């Protein structure tokens, strides 16, 4: 029990022996962790303050440690007055150490008790004491209170001004005193006075340590108070150009880096001009590197647009990209990359070649250095050329060419990073050239007997670029790849990742071969079934590759065979599900794929039925059977689209790529449905405005681009047949089944969330409840749920507000319908609902939970928890009702 533990811990505090006392004191925060109950926290802190008052100095310091650690819990203190009063009493002790500990205690407590005048006066008094420990404690407490309070801030600002101006203060204490001024951002005039004070400081104390501290404090103050940021940047540039000391210059670099990271837009053209001039003039490599890092950080924002041709920045960037030092070259080429991508001015198009060639030079420099700094510079250069290629395709071709030329002679880690960069290049830009594939295959061959330890990641990355490059099917080169794998790998995990990439890029035959080869290595049950299911899905998709244009019999045959393999695969997959990591997304995705293929099979069957079931002689109702079958097909495809949308809403944890893939599947379903509608059911109602910029969309994957291309082709095909034929013409079914086989021609691509799941978040959804309640007293149910997270909470999404919806029904009707939106508010929400049950009997209470993200999208994620409640009345009400029922 909470109170039992509290007093069992308390008896240690009263033990007298110091060991047990300090043991209990440091045991207290764990008790707060177990029981965040404000009653317990209040009582415990009162006991803490009592023992702090009466105890010796070491016990007081232990209580100080506890107070500092228990920061999150102390805003729930009820009797703050008594607590701080008995804490404050120790400040009158003649023992300077006790006064210092009390000052530190008040500083820790400053969050819950600002604007307390006696505490402020105690801080102000101790600041001018003689004992250095008390003075340092007073400085710390002043920092905290000035962070919290406002009037205290201006008072301490005045006192610090007259103290630093004074001569009694030693140099070290002056150093400790200056960063107090970083909290003077409470109002404009106070900040301006602090700025005048800091100007006085830098003028009249020019030695290294305190100019360092003072101008860093000025930087923080300007960052907090945005009014004086331009003059602060101007002052920093002045100190960078004029001051000769290396340390002061390096601090200026760091402060400008902070300001660039925190407010790039405020920078002016003059500031960038001055920084570029400083970079050009200085001869030291380290200072140049740092200020070019600042410039590069600026270049990756809107500062370039505010800056604007050939100017100081361009000349500096060109000069630095060929500098000997690796870091300077990296930052210079990044500046050139940013300036080229950001704007399309004529001089930029002229100098874009310079950026590319400098990038190649950096690549050849870093291709064999093999050091962590070299790895970082190589990563920077590869990211820069990926961005440049995303901006400049005609440059991207030469980028690909030089990447392939340097791939062969590069080292293993350099090859891994180069392959990652090339994979990004190929994924974003489709027309990479199949001439790449020969070089990659040749490189893959020689690497087969290269090493054993680092060979694994190089192999998987090389296989990834092979699959991404092969937009079409494979050949005997796949046989070479699998032979090399079987001969040299002997690891399996790399085989699994290569098969996973194969399934990702649609090379499903390779995936089938690898999964079949890999089945024996596994040891568990669910993993064995999962691998078998992946093998069967790969086989089913490799069956899909047998389609040819305009052949519909073979198309139906392939669809049926793929349905057989898919059913075997889904049986194996649903055998693999376990309570730990239940394969929910995979099961639902495979079910929807099977249902879509079944819908295509039935639609092909109806297109054949147009000639197989001629219209009755009794008889656009002439082809009655075909009309009814097309109605059923439209219903089935609409339901399939709705279920794909439901899967989309349920897949909140999934990444962007998986969501886009599911959206593409739903769009295919909607395309088939709309084609059915326009061609058969009502071409008059088909007033489509499809004419637009659909083809100009930026597709992020080859599969997505092909899907959009076939969408556009089918849509323009439908429009040409809008009115040109009778509603049940053979051309309609011909175009429809042509669209079906065209959609099925491209291979299905899996995504991250199918294999690897991140951002795992669920809702416990506790509540306050086989249940019954009086009908007169309407039910009030309190619900609350902790929102669990796994590793990074906000990786892709960020839950901005929980949405709760609850329903009531009898015979197990929708009688209690209301929606509530509540924020997590420290990742644990709570609220209540009021429900009524007029009907006596069995009532089911279904409560649903939905998640609203930062973008405003509504996601149906949480548990579909349901509870049963019985409805009944009290005895005397029923008795009087029966008696008066005349």
């Amino acid at each position: 029990d909470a109170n039992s533990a509290l007093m069992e811990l308390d008896k240690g505090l009263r033990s007298g022996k110091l060991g047990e006392q300090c043991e209990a004191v440091v045991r207290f925060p764990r008790l707060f962790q177990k029981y965040p109950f404000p009653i317990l926290i209040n009582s415990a802190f009162l006991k803490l303050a009592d023992v702090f008052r009466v105890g010796n100095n070491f016990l007081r310091l232990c209580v100080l440690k506890v107070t500092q650690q228990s920061e999150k819990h102390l805003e729930k203190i009820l009797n703050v007055d008594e607590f701080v009063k008995r804490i404050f009493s120790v400040i009158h002790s003649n023992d300077p150490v006790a006064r210092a500990i009390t000052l530190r205690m008040l500083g820790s407590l400053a969050s819950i008790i600002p604007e307390r005048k006696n505490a402020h006066h105690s801080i102000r008094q101790s600041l001018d004491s003689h004992d250095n420990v008390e003075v340092e404690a007073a400085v710390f407490a002043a920092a905290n209170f000035s962070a919290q309070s406002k009037d205290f801030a201006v008072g301490i600002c005045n006192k610090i001004s007259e103290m630093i101006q004074g001569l009694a203060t030693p140099v070290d204490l002056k150093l400790k005193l200056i960063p107090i001024l970083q909290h003077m951002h409470h109002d404009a005039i106070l900040a301006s006075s602090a700025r005048q004070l800091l100007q006085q400081l830098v003028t009249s104390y020019p030695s290294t340590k305190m100019v360092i501290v003072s101008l860093h404090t000025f930087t923080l103050l300007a960052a907090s108070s945005l009014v004086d940021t331009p003059k602060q940047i101007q002052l920093l540039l002045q100190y960078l150009k004029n001051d000769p000391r290396k340390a002061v210059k390096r601090l200026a670099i760091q402060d400008l880096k902070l300001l660039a990271n925190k407010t790039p837009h405020t920078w002016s053209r003059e500031n960038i001009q001055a920084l570029c001039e400083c970079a050009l003039q200085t001869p030291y490599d380290s200072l140049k590197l740092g200020m070019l890092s600042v410039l590069s950080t600026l270049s990756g924002t809107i500062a370039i647009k505010h800056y604007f041709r050939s100017s100081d920045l361009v000349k500096l960037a060109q000069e630095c990209c060929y500098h000997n030092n690796r870091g300077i070259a990296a930052h210079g080429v990044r500046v050139l990359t940013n300036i080229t991508v950001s704007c399309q001015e004529k001089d930029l198009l002229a100098l874009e070649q310079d950026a590319v060639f400098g990038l190649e030079s950096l690549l050849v420099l870093c291709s064999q250095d093999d050091s962590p700094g070299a790895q970082a510079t190589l990563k920077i250069a590869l990211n820069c050329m990926v961005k440049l290629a995303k901006g400049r395709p005609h440059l991207s071709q030469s980028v690909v060419e030089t990447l392939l030329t340097q791939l062969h002679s590069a080292q293993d880690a350099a090859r891994i990073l180069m392959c990652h960069c090339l994979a990004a290049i190929a994924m974003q830009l489709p027309v990479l050239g199949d001439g790449m594939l020969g070089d990659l295959m040749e490189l893959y061959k020689v690497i087969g007997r290269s090493a054993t330890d680092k060979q694994q990641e190089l192999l998987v990355s090389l296989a990834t670029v092979i699959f991404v490059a092969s937009q079409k099917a494979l050949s005997v080169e796949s046989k070479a790849v699998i032979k090399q794998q079987l001969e040299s790998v002997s690891n399996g995990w790399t085989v699994y990742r290569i098969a996973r990439q194969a399934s990702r890029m649609g090379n499903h035959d390779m995936a089938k071969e690898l999964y079949q080869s890999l089945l024996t290595q596994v040891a568990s049950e669910h993993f064995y079934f999962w691998l078998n299911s992946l093998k069967e899905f790969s086989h089913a998709e490799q069956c899909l590759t047998g389609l040819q244009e305009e052949n519909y019999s073979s198309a139906l045959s392939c669809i049926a065979e793929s349905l057989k393999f898919y059913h075997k695969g889904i049986a194996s997959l649903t055998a693999a599900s376990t309570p730990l990591n239940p394969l929910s997304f995979q099961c639902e995705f495979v079910k929807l794929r099977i249902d879509l293929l079944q819908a295509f099979s039935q639609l092909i069957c109806t297109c054949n039925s147009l000639k197989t079931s001629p219209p009755p002689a009794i008889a656009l109702q002439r082809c009655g059977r075909i009309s009814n079958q097309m109605k059923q097909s439209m219903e089935e495809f609409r339901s399939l689209a709705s279920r794909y949308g439901d899967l989309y809403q349920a897949s909140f944890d999934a990444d962007s790529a998986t969501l886009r893939n599911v959206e593409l599947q739903q769009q295919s379903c909607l395309l088939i449905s709309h084609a059915i509608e326009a061609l058969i059911l009502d071409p008059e109602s088909a007033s489509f405005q499809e004419y637009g910029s659909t083809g100009t969309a930026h597709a992020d994957s080859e599969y997505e681009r092909r899907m959009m291309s076939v969408y556009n082709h089918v849509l323009e095909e439908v429009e040409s047949l809008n009115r040109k034929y009778t509603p049940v013409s053979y051309m309609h079914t011909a175009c429809l089944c042509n669209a079906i086989i065209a959609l099925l021609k491209v291979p299905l691509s899996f995504q991250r969330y199918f294999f690897q799941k991140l951002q795992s978040t669920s809702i416990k959804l506790a509540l306050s409840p086989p249940i019954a309640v009086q009908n007169n007293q309407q039910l009030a149910l309190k619900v609350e749920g902790v929102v669990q997270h796994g590793s990074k909470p906000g990786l892709f999404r960020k839950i901005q507000s929980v949405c709760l919806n609850v329903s009531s029904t009898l015979q197990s009707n929708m009688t209690n319908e209301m929606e509530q939106r509540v924020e997590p508010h420290n990742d644990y929400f709570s609220t209540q609902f009021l429900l009524n049950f007029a009907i006596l009997g069995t009532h089911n209470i279904t409560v649903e939970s939905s998640v609203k993200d930062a973008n405003g999208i509504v996601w149906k994620t949480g548990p579909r928890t349901t509870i049963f409640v019985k409805s009944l009345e009290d005895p005397y009400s029923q008795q009087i009702r029966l008696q008066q029922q005349q």
């Binding site: 690891n491 993993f527 991140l758």
Partner: peptide
Amino acid sequence: DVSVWEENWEDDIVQDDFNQQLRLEME
């Protein structure tokens, strides 16, 4: 810090329980 490829699957700083057991199973 920056990453060369954003959609790279080989990033294994965060390994889920399924992949944790799967790696340990056959290595």
